[PDB]
Symmetry: C5
Subunit: 310 residues, 5 copies
């Protein structure tokens, strides 16, 4: 039984994050536990406070018409518990619930680990003989607790796109609101864990430029390559398959190439040295001693700019 409106009935939304958690890189989903704020004027409920009761009359959800506010991007239906319904003397209805859902939102892994993300939560509402429009009240969007975690992430801003986007979907109008959570990944742990160690085993790998023994140099380059494969896999596991090109995934394949050309180098040193031409053999290696780190530090600078700075 919808409130008879002369023109669109405006539903006012707002979201207050209480708990945020379990952002899945692989799944591209995170989880929210929050307050939902709906308000609309249904004037049929105005009881004129003096004549009976008190200033505000509270109703149970079964006695009132509520706009059905559905979430757009979410895996299952939202779980909700109705906290309060309060009808004003003039007939203004205030609805507040507490819901917990898991949100499904795209992530941009181009800059991983260092990347910044913006997560999305959409509220649509569908009309009947009246049109409903959801619209954001910045007073109920100011909300989240100072205590919200979202482990491994720094939380910048929770806001709402105030202008609803109005679809026509299956012979009716629906109003959509876009709430936005901006977060940035905490990259520190990755340096002592992934970055620096990978760099180390990479340096250790081409330390073989100071040695004349083939055997020691194959043990070297190959047994570092194994560990690099291990790191590659470890990082490749915790991340979804991208259609586009990642930064870390770039430098990791680069390091693959440097391992190959390293193997090529020492092999060339061997064949040349059993051809009894060490004159050239020491020359190649001594060149490598500079060329390999320079090409690296160069290409990394090349790569660095091409992603972040451009």
């Amino acid at each position: 039984p919808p409130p008879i409106a002369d023109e669109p009935l405006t539903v006012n939304t707002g979201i207050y994050l209480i708990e945020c958690y379990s952002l899945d890189d692989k799944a591209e989903t995170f989880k929210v536990n929050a307050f939902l704020s709906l308000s609309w004027k249904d004037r049929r409920l105005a009881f004129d406070p003096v004549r009976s009761g008190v200033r505000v009359k509270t109703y149970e959800p079964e006695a009132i018409w509520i706009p059905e506010i559905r979430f757009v991007n979410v895996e299952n239906a939202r779980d909700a518990d109705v906290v309060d319904i309060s009808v004003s003397p003039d007939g203004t209805v205030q609805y507040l619930e507490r819901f917990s859902a898991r949100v499904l939102s795209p992530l941009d892994f181009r800059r991983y680990p260092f990347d910044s993300q913006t997560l999305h939560i959409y509220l649509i509402v569908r009309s009947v003989d009246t049109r409903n429009i959801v619209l954001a009240v910045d007073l109920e969007k100011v909300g989240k607790n100072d205590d919200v975690f979202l482990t491994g992430w720094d939380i910048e801003s929770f806001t709402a796109v105030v202008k609803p986007a109005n679809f026509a979907l299956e012979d009716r109008l629906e109003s959509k609101l876009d709430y936005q959570l901006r977060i940035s990944r905490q990259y520190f742990s990755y340096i002592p864990n992934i970055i620096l160690p990978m760099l180390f085993i990479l340096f250790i790998s081409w330390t073989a430029f100071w040695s004349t023994s083939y055997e020691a140099n194959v043990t070297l380059v190959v047994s570092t390559l194994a560990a690099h494969i291990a790191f590659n896999i470890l990082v490749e596991t915790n991340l979804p398959k991208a259609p586009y090109m990642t930064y870390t995934g770039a430098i990791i394949f680069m390091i693959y190439l440097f391992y190959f050309v390293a193997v090529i180098e020492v092999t060339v040193q061997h064949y040349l040295k059993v051809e009894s031409q060490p004159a050239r053999a020491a020359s190649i290696t001594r060149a490598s001693r500079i060329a390999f780190p320079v090409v690296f530090l160069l290409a990394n600078i090349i790569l660095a700019f091409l992603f972040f700075g451009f």
Copy 2:
């Protein structure tokens, strides 16, 4: 309480995909959240627009006879919320719900990774004293969000096969509709992560043909074999057990053979060389240096054509 019909009762379906996610290669199941659209004429509820009510009279599901529309390939029973029931004036019912299910549909790993898949979602309905037929409306089946994800896939087309399939099952007739999601795998990461590194360790594998020392030659071929077993396991892990032969499983086993015959070669070289026949020893290896890459580049061409282009 079915509407008493003159001939088969026709129910008109349509699906609007809202969110897609969790396509599980191993499980051969994916997850869908969409709109379900049913419309049918149950004439027993007769209006008079002028005499009473308005153009449209809204009912709650308990007051109406609804067709029982079940999904065929789904794990557990499908979960749903009725969004709207609007009875048109003539006794035409417009039923719209929003459902979330996990669909069980076959996958083809033959061309893996590169292949296209066509996912199936089947709708049945069963009759009682009247027969029912479900049928697709291409206007309501085009459904999709321009935002639908299915991470790691390119989504081409969502459609429905217009002709209902009518089974006879346990002394009653059922009608089945086939909705199709045509998607193609996004193959990008597979090159910098799996393919190319595997090729690299394969080339590194036979880099030992330029060396005369047995020891370096066992370290090379074996420690590359290890990495190849590692990749083998890595790819074997994320994929279901195939009754047929995969492309990647083909070339991977081929690469295994090349590690094997490489091993035989270097062994034969050592025994030959301590027999003081370096005449033969340098000759065999020098043959290997060309034959091995060539057979591969051939075998891949042999293999590649044999799968995709034929």
Copy 3:
């Protein structure tokens, strides 16, 4: 309120498999989605066709006494949806639902991977003031769809034991039926993935019999043993702990033994060679070059018969 019976009240069962999926080796559980078909005569419901209504009268679950039919081997309770109830004129009730459960059934890993299994689904019923007995109707028990999967398994036959087993449990009688889904594993992938590579690394392992250098010979056997431990663990992981001896767990342990006696061989050969007794050193090894593959191919045959052909 059960129908007053002159003698045992007979319920007629049947299952129509719709979906099969998720057979868990470790868990020894699989998952079924099917039709359940129950039928019984309640003569209290026979109003006879002519006096009112029609040939068949449909009832809602709340208005009829329904036999309470429970599944025996199942982890948690089954989820079910009542499809139809049709009472015939004479008082014959036709009950049909669709259920989804996960069944817990024993598996035999002796012949693994090559093994065949027969999965069980048991249906019971408990009595009250009348005794109930379940019995199979081969017309509804033929149940299967030509589309049923059970990915990684070949489905042979779904049938039901017509004769019920009658327990006395806690001062009342219960009737049990045994439904059987007979399946055989798809064993193909194990050859390009586990079997053949294990054999390769096993042969490559004992390639060291053609060389006199100790160092190369320790690198060989050890770095192959690593890979065999990897395969051992990988297969051991996806399989439950067996109280008995598997074929695969057998040949894998046998292969372990060959790795150990190999180590003993090269160990003896070096010490023999620095004792300046190459006479014995080349002799032992030359015996090994034939003996080792001979023992394998034999022991495999010994083992193979002892499991399969016996």
Copy 4:
């Protein structure tokens, strides 16, 4: 509305195991699907066997006062279906349900793998204006289905402690019964899988005592040590973190020690042998050849008794 009792009302319990499964070592939880049997005298429902009805009157749960019986050590609320409520003439109600829960019970990993465990299932009941006390009926507890699995475990005895323990909890008295599932682990697969291979790589580790070469001897002890770390991690992985000392975690640490002292030994052999004092060098190694198996076989005999035999 509890039955008016002259003194404490005694509830008679019993459990009948149907399925046992999913014993999780890490979780220290298992899963049971069984029968719960309660019987109590509520005299307000009195017999008038002749006056009306029959010998036994069956009630639906909502029409009787039923005791609320809750499980103590459990994760979530227990899942249950009412099988039968049959009130005996005397006002004795016979209540029978079927439940499925996952129980949380301590495990003792002191003797792992070989250990026996006793799982606990606790039933409490809370009083109101009458006191309730539960007590076991050995007729309904005396059994389990002969088919109960608990994969990877041997089932000894299902029993119940007949004496109730009465807590005072939040100003009311509660009665607790301790049901015990006494089981012992199936330890066979661990030998062909874990034990023996570790032993082999350990023996192989110190086989280097028959060789004078340093490089081959670092290869041996180190690459056996690697595989031992692998097994260590493998076992440490499937088991929860102990506050106490395990047997396997002990001998594994001992084995770590032996790999360490092996490396120390061969290193010492090298520095001594390049100092040109082979007189001492051959002596040390020859001593190790016996002491190492002796210290080991001794330390193990010591360890074995201290756990099992004491």
Copy 5:
């Protein structure tokens, strides 16, 4: 419909922990199953003990106004069952339920493994036309069963902070109570599992200071570093990504540094030795033999204080 009050309605809370379990470090979540204890006076229900009935009258949740008591840091809505409602004559309502929820509480990994943690459980409540205040009664907060596990943790004390925190949240007042579960990690398994083995392979690593052969000295450092990375990964995996610096993650990076400088040392020794200046080489190596354990034992002493003792 709240009890009409002259001033704030005081709710008295309390918690009795029954089970603690499944503390997840990565997740920073644990699970509790406990008693919730509420008591408040609603005077509208009046005492007429003599006039009718008895001392205490029991009500079903639907007939009384109940405070809506919500948990703050929790993932999903808590699932709960009402154990008892007994209203005392004076209008004292005694409410007791049993709930199972999963709590989300921060953990501090700075001292991991050795760390002590304090888990938080917050109870808020929201007002209507009356203001509500929750407050702790330490007699009902005394709760935990002597049986509570939290496997791998020692449970010290479960308490409640007596002063409620009173928020003003979205135009209404809410009252929050802070419950604390103080636990200390059982750090024992970590010595035989992670700590000691890592220490051993670290000593084995620089055992190469007693050897002059390049090959053996590269095999050493490399094959120890590989396993050390393996341990790094094993630990980094079971731990969430830290924004700050952990103790274990610190000493692990330090150890990485010592491996790097070790490789550097042997590398310099070889080239120095083929420069035919072993005079310098043996000096360097002999300096290392003390400096490395000394610097280590120093740096470890330095690091340890910086975390724990300050």
